[PDB]
Design a protein around this motif. Sequence first.
Motif, PDB file in Angstrom:
ATOM      1  N   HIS A  92       0.859  -1.168   0.000  1.00 36.66           N
ATOM      2  CA  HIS A  92       0.000   0.000   0.000  1.00 36.66           C
ATOM      3  C   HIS A  92       0.897   1.220   0.000  1.00 36.66           C
ATOM      4  O   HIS A  92       2.122   1.095   0.087  1.00 36.66           O
ATOM      5  N   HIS A  94       1.459   5.528   1.347  1.00 38.85           N
ATOM      6  CA  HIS A  94       1.011   6.762   1.979  1.00 38.85           C
ATOM      7  C   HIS A  94       1.411   7.981   1.155  1.00 38.85           C
ATOM      8  O   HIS A  94       2.536   8.065   0.663  1.00 38.85           O
ATOM      9  N   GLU A 104       6.189   8.755   5.137  1.00 43.25           N
ATOM     10  CA  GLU A 104       6.175   8.567   6.579  1.00 43.25           C
ATOM     11  C   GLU A 104       7.611   8.688   7.058  1.00 43.25           C
ATOM     12  O   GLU A 104       7.898   9.449   7.974  1.00 43.25           O
ATOM     13  N   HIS A 117       4.856   0.755   0.810  1.00 43.28           N
ATOM     14  CA  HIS A 117       5.204  -0.250   1.805  1.00 43.28           C
ATOM     15  C   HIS A 117       4.822  -1.644   1.318  1.00 43.28           C
ATOM     16  O   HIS A 117       3.640  -1.964   1.189  1.00 43.28           O
ATOM     17  N   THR A 196       2.915   1.287  11.238  1.00 50.11           N
ATOM     18  CA  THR A 196       2.719   2.730  11.293  1.00 50.11           C
ATOM     19  C   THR A 196       1.238   3.083  11.379  1.00 50.11           C
ATOM     20  O   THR A 196       0.869   4.258  11.377  1.00 50.11           O
TER      21      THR A 196
HETATM   22 ZN   LIG Z   1       2.279   1.715   5.434  1.00 47.35          ZN
END
Ligand SMILES: [Zn+2]
Length: 258
Positions: A92, A94, A104, A117, A196
């Motif tokens: 996925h 961010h 992140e 990720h 996270t």
């Molecule tokens: Zn992630």
Amino acid sequence: HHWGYGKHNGPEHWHKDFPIAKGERQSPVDIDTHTAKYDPSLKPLSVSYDQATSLRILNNGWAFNVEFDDSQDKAVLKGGPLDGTYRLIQFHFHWGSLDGQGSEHTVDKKKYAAELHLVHWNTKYGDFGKAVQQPDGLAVLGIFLKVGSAKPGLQKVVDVLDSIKTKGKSADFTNFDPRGLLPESLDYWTYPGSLTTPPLLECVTWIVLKEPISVSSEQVLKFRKLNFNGEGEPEELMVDNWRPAQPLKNRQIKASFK
Ligand SMILES: [Zn+2]
């Protein structure tokens, strides 16, 4: 009322339901390139995605996951700081509302437009559920995204986002090759961390690649068209679904390169 990325349920609120949010090995963290030390003990990193079998993509209200069949060893991560075999279960992103934020992890405080990720679990633990309860249960490969030239291998993902605009929606996503999301170099930093997102378990060995991948403004813009909300609800754009850097505490980030 559950966690999210809003002003009233954002990262700064998570600790109330998940105390470990203020733990000793939380992720993400800022990677200080000058303090990270080259580690000669690190063995070659092995990313074998040739037999990866994607199955579906879903918008879980937090991001969207491309899920893979992990009922057998087909796509595995080995070597580097890892011992044994970690199996790819899903990946996925961010991303931010603007190109200047979204990642992140940060590098010398620099925030990238997004972060990918690829989540893998240690096969010695039998399944993902048991793995997350172990300090070395997960290995997550992090890859930074910057805005520039389009990434051919990501377009297939971009093309299906319209079909899973809202939370709860999923769509068939077979035959997707994750090798198309990897940068040229595998140089990386590694440190012990956590998930996270809630429940923020500290079961993650983190392997963040130094070289980012370029994606087009057009590709990132489609990411920003997704919704945090479910169908038939007031539109909240799925943007800025990233957790900020956390205290490094008693940890050292190791580099695979010089
Ligand atoms: Zn992630």
